[PDB]
Each structure stands twice: as structure tokens, then as C-alpha cells.
């Protein structure tokens, strides 16, 4: 009926101009990403509020997503500005301070010396240049260049295979998380996730400050894909970072890891975001490459809850066009086929059997919408992963949840009061839906909800009715 | 299956008039009591009727009361000697005039026989044991030739397959009996000799004149009924497969397929179906049935029948209790052995239908202890019963009459409750009613099917899964 | 024409001149010699009268020798004598009474292998211990006979109709033939017509899925032996001409032989074939198709005439004798030749043939071939 | 899946002319060699053609040869300066007359451009990198305005979306190239610029004049082709999805769905489908592909494609071997992971079709080591290939040409054998051929699909299941 798949946009320099955050929202932004690798806390505060004003003004829900940097592992500065590391040369990467020199340059990752051992590979600038550790002589990691090429200030370094010992949250991240939690963000994404235990360190900080939001694990490393199931269960959502996965994994394995992660997320009613290398050409162009449009469309077809724009909106010259184009692709894929990859988990539990039954009933009776009452989102997220073409309307008393459900597939959320009785809950649904030009009296709707209000049995009720069938 | 699901109808007569015998039936399993208005004066019925109601109250078991209307009385008159023998090839006269019976000439009770019969029509006597053929009508007399010979005696039944019979489906006598039964307070009425869907209208005329309707059961006795099977099942509220009678007027080998087809047809439309006659007739004189009879009963059960019926076995027999116990024991045995009954083919398309199927699925998938259905007329319960789900099926109704009417519906126990004021109060009532009987306890999972806000214009439209007393404190 | 098969018992009542032939003409498919009655000479004379009748009419007729049976061993001393006699006499099958265990067949096989001649052994389901081992017995024996009268002596009477259904099902799942016997038309021992209750009972055996039904005293000692067979036939036909199908089978085929039989039926039905043709050396391939109770005519072709008699008791199967086949292509040409000699089917009519790889191959059934009659006729 | 199923097409050019390089491709996995008639003179092709045939014989691997016809050459002429710059808002003239190139005015190779162009038509240049709009046709000059600016050089491609282009599908030059290729002995021909199902007839005219037909592959390059997708897939023998070209004339977001739709359409009709353009273009300059490219390839495989095609990657690139090795490695990885492919909706209705599906079922159910199909033209094997069954699929044919033609069909290896004399002999041949391979041994179960008696009128009509050498001595 409208766009189902959700769009995440990154905020940066390019979205600071007059009424531009609002222009994004109007073009379709559902979640706004605050990237804490860049900007001062003040730039974020001002972006954060511009989103909230835009969300109020337009009426559209917009979640706010705090992206934590994780371990900053990159080159230091060169005195020259740049150099060239040709094959066979010896080079020293040091955890000490030094001036940028062809033969010797610093790294930001202070533990590199203690972690590196003879043999470990060291990749630079998205794996464009590759080195190998010969030995650790004090603060210096002595390497040999295996694949040559140009190198400059502050290029990324990847250490596949190496037993890296940084925690998932740096000291700097804890400050950023704390800031974001107080600022009022709706979700937090953790980078460099390697184990299901990594969520605990985010939860420590949340419980100290006394405020928890959904935590999104970013799938960037092989160790993450090695624990894919345990991670999807321990976190609240996942983000497939294809660029980063492509650096450390076989390139041919990556398209299958994407599909597998998306499937895994849907089986467990967790949201999945697909990020990186989406429409990167639109950083410089008003239109994408054919290859990019195809790639995006396959993310949609793979079953993804949301797709994410990075530089396309954060630094690009065509931020609106990027969002409009992502929308137009998502729509086109959806308008063409209902079908998404089938799920294999058979529902066994009261809440699961009911979610499936509700969808069946709704589809079989040609309902105009599927209404789900929810206190945390769980009940709606269980319906969303089915990719039913029924509009999916969440009704909740907790307004935070409306923002959190911005990143979940096909879902619009309405904020309503706490319900006093089941019959009152039906009356509320009528009231809320009739306010919208979309619905009128006579339209068939399916409601999923709680026995007597605030019951010990959670979701346990399916109710089919036409709007205002009992009004006179 | 935790209990007997299939229901048992028993006929009341001479054999059930002595001391606390109606009660003995009920305790043995009788779910519906049949009052057969071809025998007894109105006083015998009044006394039986009340004995059933007292038994029902005493035991706590629901017992429906079924008024069987006679329809056209078509049989031989009396013979002066008491009997004769009509041997093959002989000419014989069956007359609408009064006469004393002789071999050559005997009267019939069916006064229109002369004007209805035509050259060629077959005239079958004594459950089709002897067959004649009309050569012509000379005045009073229908002049026949014997095709299959055998003995004939006073007042033996006559069946006229193929013949353009012109009696109405409701005789003058039936209208009196119907009127009596309606006022007496019976819960259902069965019409004999049904040939067309229109036949129900003549019963409805009488009901609406007296101002009281009950479910009307079409008895499938004639070929013309099976010719209109679908239109009849839709127009009536239930059907009864009368096997003996169908066996006389159709090829005997076609009957087992007609039974299956009628039962199927009834289940597709959420109408009850009763299977009657040729059940355990040997038990009129014997304490045990023939193997062939046990097989017959079991096949009715397997065919998908809501209820099975005893006739002479309880109404005139010498072993009425044993007959009911035996029918029960067979029904149980068939059920305890397989869940499976013939699949239904109607795909549900309507809100009420989709919900009934969904409720059953949910109930079975979650291993619910019972499936509870609220209902004003039975419709919602009957839609679940036809599925032959092994979940106990508990109807909740405000109308007490319905509890008696649901006595003939498969697998169903009914509870009578107050009018509900709110949906949440309705859930609380279900808990209260179930807990009264020390079968359900706190924690047992049940599925409820019911009405949006109480007295909603959308009838049944709600499915609700809960464990008993999960919210009490 | 009739699909379900009829077994008739021979006795005093069928010794009249050309009465056996009258049975065969009325429909007898299997002739039962009951070795609890008669001298060996009465059997010899009946045996030959059947064989002459079978030749004369052209109709296949199996001969089933019924060992009386007799805690007791499975085979009495007397049975061993009767079995030995019957085997040499040339019977096509043996039925064993009082079967209680799957091991019981071994004692019959000992005797067969001593004399050097094996035929199918039919276990008679007469006792509770048999029903307790129903599956193991159906597997060890080659066929089963449901004796309802006898089961009714020791079992709850109401349980018997469900045991009948269960045994018939069990037999069909394992491609064994099942006969339903006892209490069929016993009234016709004294009457020219049966009770309604009896006609209904027979029809229920048919509908339950039975390969064959059996007459006992009705033909062996009755006064209306022909009428009994004619009436059983007329009923079986009438039941068949109505009902479409038989109780579904649930056993999933997993073996080469089984997967092919199911596939052949599917292909046949999907393509609207007029017939299902089976080549067979031992019967197995035909028996696998018969148990399906497919409404397709089922035509068996065999070189071994003993097998044509043995297939007489399998459902819906007509069997023809042909020569030993020299090559697969020759075998297809034979099927065309034989089918045109029936002149039953027409120019473009499809049939499906199931057969053996190269003739006398170690893989038994392993070939499906769809062809039109006279398609390679230029 | 036991080996690579999806097939690889490689284009031959300058980069594949060096020492034993065609052979190195074949060894790396090339199944079809594309001869592109937009580059090279007839002598370069003759030498490539023979190098392929020698390589095919030497390695034992089947290698098809594919003649790609240019179709209408629609592009810029030459510039005197060599290149220019067309900036937005400027007026420029593209002329069908001869001239040397200036900024203001340059010639086109497409001589009909004047007669075809009308006010409003768009003119896209160099893969749509620059866009113009026609203001008028003033004689030989098509006077345009630049809508999207950018650099332009000698001999750049132009696309004319929407414009009623009037060139036939076969130029005069193409007919010469087709004729050459047919005599040379190529196994298939691909036609560019296909717009209608009638376009195949013009190729068939030429084939029938020369007296030799091969499969004709329609290249899906234009919107009009996708508008007739079904009629085209039926009239041609195969299709090639050219995504780059479709991307210039169609909405970019629609292209991924057109690819999927064409692949599906081809499989439903047992026609091969090749997916071409922009597969691993980065490997023209690099020893490894972009992640986006590997993903794209893998999605073509998953979409259901019979074959994937390399263009510049092998024809002009610096890593031609690595390109084919990499394409192989991706195809394998996708396949080793899931045997699932998009389901088909085609229900088989015909004797030959029902049998093909039944054979597959039987094979899969019995866990056969291979499915052997006898075929005169390929049709029988192509009907099994589109099912994407994980059974090895072994074609047996007496026509050697078919082995080359089946090189582009999914999952299919072909064996060339003598004409069969008898069905039993044909089974013996299957054993003989398979036993030569160390892959098969005595005892392996295989399913054979074939013809009744050899040279029967009833096409495919026989399924035979056997273990290799079960009757051996």
C-alpha cells in the first residue's frame, strides 16, 4: 500500500543547512543515524533536536540512532601527508608517538604491539594495501609489505585473524553512549562486535545511567558471523556491514552472509539493517550506477527490515536525491512481488502461534489492516518479520516505542492511552483509525492484543471487526 | 478423545414406561429422547416427556426431546384371516375402499393410492420383502401383479418408490401432533417422508402460527430426498439418514454411499446428522448384537455422524439399557482408535468460518484442554463440532433451550450462563463455570471463541487463549 | 466387469456333472479345496474338473488348498500329509489355519522345500494371537484371510469389523492379497436369495478394500451353489459401479520396486491412460499395482502359467500368457500384439507398461514405458 | 551438487590470442566461446575458431562457439580534434552526411537518424553519460540541445530510447557475418537489438538459404524486447540479458526485476538464458573484483541463470584467466550452499513432459548418481535442466553438434555416442560410456530417459532405473 522497508540516513556536514533534516524526513527518512566517530557533542545536540522538531512537524516517526565508534584502529599522521609502501619493503608501525615517515609511522591502536605476533596480517585502506608482521621490537610492529600502494594520514587498518584485545566499548565510547542516553536517543549501535557478551558492556553503562534502549550489533568481523545466532539472540538488532565484511572474508562468501544474517534476524523477530556501499556513487552524482540499484534491490528482496545511507547523506552533494532514490527502489521491488524468503522456524508458543494465526486470518478475510497492541514492540516485530502485505499498525502507550519501531519493517505506530478494558481497547482502535483519511467505517481490521488489560498471559487475543459496526 | 463424542438418540415407548427406566437410559448415555407420534395417545407422551425432564435435572446431563411426526400413513389394511400369502405371478387388488381382507383383495390406509398409482409403478410391502406392480386402476382397486412373493399380514408397511404420491408432507394428524409437541415443550421436530426443500415451510407455517420454532430434522427416507440432498440440508436444520427405508426404495448397494454423502453434506453446512434404523435391531430380542450390526454402527460413526439412533431396541425391546450401553461401547471403541474422520472440502471464506477453523488450529497446536464457544443459537458450536476436533467442545449460552438442542450435536457439552455485560466479564465467567466442575483447575489452557463487544452486530469474531485464573490474586 | 475376486469352496454340492464349470462361468476366480472334509480321491477329481473348466472357458482359476490346522504345533501330522498331497497334485496356493505367529510359515516352507515346490501361503486370521502379530504375520506370509466368524468367537464382537478393516489395510500396504471369509451369504445354503443384512455385510467388505471375498458352505454343501456365486458377483459389481475409490494407502514407497509402481500409476492417471500393463515373472510387480485399487484396467503378462493362477486372487487384475521374452524391444512389440488381439483398445490409446530392465535382469521391476497402440505400426 | 552446474561464457579478443590461452580458458572453465563481430576481421575469427576446437578436443571438455552479431551500428562519427565537450544548454548537430568532426557538428554512423528522429526524441551518448534532445530535423542535420553535459569522443555509442528506429534487426553487414559464421561452423548465433519476435525470421531466412540452422539467441537490450518478453522467448531459442544496455533505456530500479523475470520466463519454456554485461568489469584492470560485483554475480546465479558471460574481462583485460577462475569460484560457492532455485509454475501436460518430471522425481527419490537423457536435438535435456535438479544431468546424443549447443545449458554434460540399434543396447552403451569415467563405478544407480524402440514416433517415452553392470559378466 505504501513503502514498507525502512530507510536509515546518516547525519553530518551535508545535513546542517536550512530545513534539511526536515527535507529528509519528508523524502522518507525513518531513522536518523548519529555517527560518533565525527563531530563535537554540540553538532549532535543540534542535529538531534532538528530531527525531533521535524518528526513533530511532519507527524512522521523518526528514530534516532547513536552509532558508537568502537576501537579506533588506523594510521597516524605522516609529516609528508602521504607516502608509498611498495611490495617487499620493511615498514614499522608504532604505538608510540612519532612523526609520519615512510619507514615509520604511528597507529592509533595503542595495544597493537601487545596483540601482534609473527605472522599476523595487517591490511590498510579497506585492504588496498597488505602487510605481514615479522616481529615486535618494543613499541614497533615490524612488517613487510605483501601488496603495495599509496598510503596517507589516518587510513583504516584491519587485523583479520589477529587476537585483538580491545574491549568492544572504548573509554571514549562510554562517554559518547552516556551523552547519547541523556540526550534521549532511541537506539545504540555497537561497532566491532565479536561475541554475544559484547552487549553486556553496553548494558552495564545503560543500567548505571538507568536507561536502556535497543542495542544494534554491527556485523563487521568474521568472529561476529562465527557467532551469528548467539549475537542475534543477545542483541536487539543487527546491521550487516558489507564493506567491512568484504575486507576480512572471502568476497564470494559475503552475499551469502548477508542473506544468512537477514534470515537469522527475521527468524528471531529482530530487526536487520543493511549498510555500507549502498549508493556511494551518489556522493558525487545525481544518479546511481546500475550495479548499485541492483545491489539495493537485492537487499530488499533478501528480506531486510531497513536499508542505510552513510556518506550519501552525511557528506554527499545529493542527500535528498539519495533518499528519494533509495525509496523509489524499495518501492519498485515491493510493488512487483509480495514474496520474501520463507521462514523455517515453526511457531510453538502461545504468542507465536497467535501471531501467525492473526496474519492468516487477516489475509484470508482481505483485511485492510492488522492492528497490534504492544508495550515493548515484541508483538509487532513478530508480525513484521512475516512481511505480510497487510498494513501493520502498532498501538502503544509508551511513546519511546514508536521511535524504536521506526526501524522495523512495514510498521506505523500510534500512541494511545493505557487501556482500561478489552471492549474499550476495541473502541480506541476505531477512534484512532477513523482520524486517518485512510480508513472509514466498514473497513475490516484484525486486532491482536492482551487478555484482560495488563494480563499475565501477554498477547493472547485475536479480534476481527469492521470499523464502527456497532456505532449508530 | 477424553469422552464419548458421538451422541445417542433413544426412542421412548412401552419398554421405557416402567420404574425409573427413563432415568436408567440417561445414566447409560441417552442424549436425545425420541417421542414417536405414530404410537401412543397424548397422555403417554406427557408422562414420558416429564420423566425425561426430571431425569435431565437429576443427573445434570442435558437430554434433548425429539418429536417424530408420522407423515403419510401408507400401509395395508386388515385381513379377515389375519394374514395371507401373495405368490409370484398372482393378480391381487389393493383397494382404497373399506373391505375385510382376503387373498384376492385387501384395503390400504392410503386413501389416494388409486388416483396416484399408474400402470408400471412398483408397490413394495413389508420392508420391500414382497413386490407388486400395478397393471391398472379399476375404480377403488389398484390391480397388481406379484413380482416377488411372500407372506403378508395386517397393517404391513407399503413403499411406493417412483410413484407420484400426492399426500402432503404434513398430514392433518401431524399438525395436531406438532402443535401438541410444540406446546408440550419439545426441543426438536422430525418430519417424515420429506421429498423437497419446500417441505420445511409447512412445518414453519404451524410453528409461526403457534409462535414457537424449534430445529426441524428432515428424515431422509425417499429417493426424491436424496435427489435434493443439498437443497434439503440447507432448508432444514438437521437430517436423519433412515437406512432401512432408503434400502427399500433405492438399490441396497447404493445406501452406504448415500449415508456417507448425506453425512458429509451435513458437516460441510454445520448441520447435525443422525443415523437411524438398521442399527442393533437384533437386540430387541437378544442381549448381544450380530457382528454385522456392530460393523454397521461402527461405519456410521466412522462416516462422520453427529448422532446414532435406537428405535425398537429401546422403544419395545427387552434389553433397552444393554442396547444403549452397547451403542456407547461401539462408538467409544471407534473413537478411541482413530481421531481421523472424512476430511471436509469447503474452504472457509466468511469471517465466522475462518475464525472457527483458526480457533481449532490454535487450540490443537497449543494443546488446549478445551475449546469454549459462546453462542446464542448453536451456530458457532456446530461449526466447530463438524470438524471432529478431539478438543473437548464446551458451548456457553444464555438460552437454556439451546443446551437441549445441542444434545444431538457431536462432541458437545453445554453450559448455561447469564447475559454478559462486558468481554472481560465473559472471560471471568468462563473461568467460574469451568472451575465449578472438578475437571478443570487453575492453570489449564483454554481457547474461547466469542463476540466482539457483547451483543455486537458482527456475531462471533474473537479468539482468546488463556490459562484459568492466571490473573486472579 | 468385475474387479474384486471371488473364492468358492468345493465340496459335496459341486460334484454334479459339469457343475464346476458352471461355477467358473458364473465367476469363480479361486477354487478352495478344504482338507478338513473329503477323501484324497474327491479332491483329485475336483482339482481336475477345475483345470478343465479353466482351459475350456479361458478364465484363470487358482486352486487354493486349505490345510485344516489343529500346545499344538502349527502343522499337524495330518496337515503335512495333506500339504504334500496338494503340492504334488499341483495346487497354486495353500492356506494355513490356526496361525498364531510369523514363525508358523516356516513349518510349511520346510515341507515345500523338502518336496521342492513352493507356492504362496495364506495365513488365516482366526485367533487373537494372530491379530496381536498382524504386521509380522502379513510380512512373513504371502497373503491373509480374515475369518470373521472365528475371530468373533474369541474377540469382542464389536471389535471385529475394525480388525477386518485393519488387516485389509495392513495387507494392501505390503502388497499382499487379502481375502475376507466367513459369514458372507450363509442364508443361501438353504435359500435362493440372501438376507439384506448379508448383502450389506458383503458390500462393506468390498468397500473396506478387500482383494477377494470367499464363499464356504454356500457352494460346498448348499442347495444353491451357482446362485450364491452369481449373487456375490452381482453385489460386488453393484458396489463397484458406484464407489470411486478405496481407503487410501499411507505407506510411503522407498524401494526401487515400490517407487516405480507408484510412478507408473501417477503417469498413467496424469496422461489419461487406458490401461496399466505389467510384465511379471513371479507376480510381485502386479501385486504392487493391484493393492493400489487404481481404476485403470490392470493387465498382467507372464510366461509362467502358474503365476496366472496365483494372480487370480489379486484385485482388478486380468492376466495373460505370453512367450518368454528375448529383448526389451521385443517385449514392447508383444504387448502391442496381445492388446490388439483383445481388440479392446483403439488407435491412439495410451497404455503404461512396467517391466524388467533387460529380460531376466537382477533388478526385477525397473522400467516404465508409455506407448500408444500401433504407434510403431508403419 | 557434485560439480559446477552454471555455465560460463567467455568473449574472445586481443587478450586471448597469445600462446595456448584459449586452451588456458577452457581448462579454467570456459563452456562457451563468444565471437564478437563488432571487432576483428574474418581472419582473426577463423584463427580463434580453430583454437577453440583444438582446445575442446585436447581437454575433452565441450566448448560451444557463439557468433555475436552487431546489429545496427548506431554511434558517433569521428571528430577532427579527436574529442570535444558538449556542455548543458548548447545546441549541436548530429548529421547523417559525411563531415569531419567539430564541437558544433559531427556525423553518425546510423544513416537513417534523420528520417527516424522527430522533435522531442532523446539522444543518449556513451552509455547514457551525456543526454541530448532533438529540437528539429533540418535536412540531414538532427539539431539537438544538450540536457546533460559531459565529454564526447570519436566513435561513442548512442542510444535512442522511445525513438521509432527503423533499421532492420539484421544489417547488410550482419548477413555477411552470419553467413561466414554459419559456414565456419559455429554452434549458435546471437542477435543484437532485438525488438520483436518476428526478428528471428530474418535470421532463419539466411540460415535456410545457406541450409544450416543453429540456435538463435535474442539479446535483450531494448525496452520493446521486454515488452514482448514472452513472445520473444517462444520464438527464439535462448535469450541474453544485457543489463548495461537495459540500464540506459529503462528505469534503473526496474532492471534487476527484468533480469529475474526474463530468467524465470526462459526456464518456464526450457530455453537457456545467459546473463551478460557488467559482471566483473573491474577485473579488466584488477586481479580481484569489487564486493558489489561478486554480489551481483551471485544473484544472477541465484536468480536461476543457465550461464553467465564475461565480456572485456577476457576479450581485452589483463587478467583473463583470473576472471574466469573467479566467476567459477563464485558460481560454485553459491551452488554448494543452496540447491533451492526459484520454483517454476509450468505444469507438464504432455507425454514427454510428464515423463521428464517423473524421471527427475524417481531419480531424486532413489538417490540416483545421475540422470541420463537421450536426445536428438537437446529438447529433452533442456526440459530437465530448467528444473535445476541436483542430480548430475548426462545427455546422450548421436549428433555431435548438440554437445556443443548444450554447453550453454545448465548443469549438463553431454556424451556423443553411435546410433542405437535396440533399447537393451542403449542401456549397455550408457554403462560403457560412464565406466570410462573414474567418476562412475559398477553398482551406481542411474535413471535413463529415452525413446521407446529406437527411432520411434513417440519421442521420449521410457524411464529405466538401473545399477551399472548389474547384468555384467
Author numbering:
A (entry chain B): 1 to 472
B (entry chain D), D (entry chain A): 0 to 472
C (entry chain C): 2 to 71, 165 to 472
The authors write:
PYK (EC 2.7.1.40) forms a tetramer that catalyzes transfer of phosphate from phosphoenolpyruvate (PEP) to ADP to form pyruvate and ATP. MtbPYK adopts a tetrameric architecture formed by identical subunits with three domains (A, B and C domains), similar to typical PYK structures. The catalytic site is located in the cleft between the A and B domains (lid domain), while the C domain harbours a canonical AMP allosteric site. The allosteric site binding for G6P (sugar monophosphate site) is adjacent to the AMP site and lies between the A and C domains.
Unlike trypanosomatid PYKs that use additional salt bridges across the C–C interface to stabilise the R-state tetramer structure, the motions of the AC-cores in MtbPYK require the disruption of C–C interface interactions between the AMP loop and the C-terminal tail loop (Thr455…Asp470), as well as the hydrogen bonds (H-bonds) formed between the two adjacent Cα4 structures (Thr422…Asp423). To study this type of structural plasticity and to probe the mobile secondary structural elements (α helix, β strand, loops), we superposed monomers (instead of tetramers) of all available R-state MtbPYK structures onto the T-state monomer structure. We then further analysed the movements of superposed structures and found that Cα1 and Cα4 both rotated and shifted by ~6° from the T-state (yellow) to the fully ligated R-state (cyan). We propose a three-step ‘rock-shape-lock’ model to describe the synergistic allostery of MtbPYK: (1) Subunits of the MtbPYK tetramer rock 9° simultaneously from the T-state to the R-state in response to substrate binding, movements that are coupled with interface-loop interplay and catalytic-site formation via the movement of helices Aα6′ and Aα6.
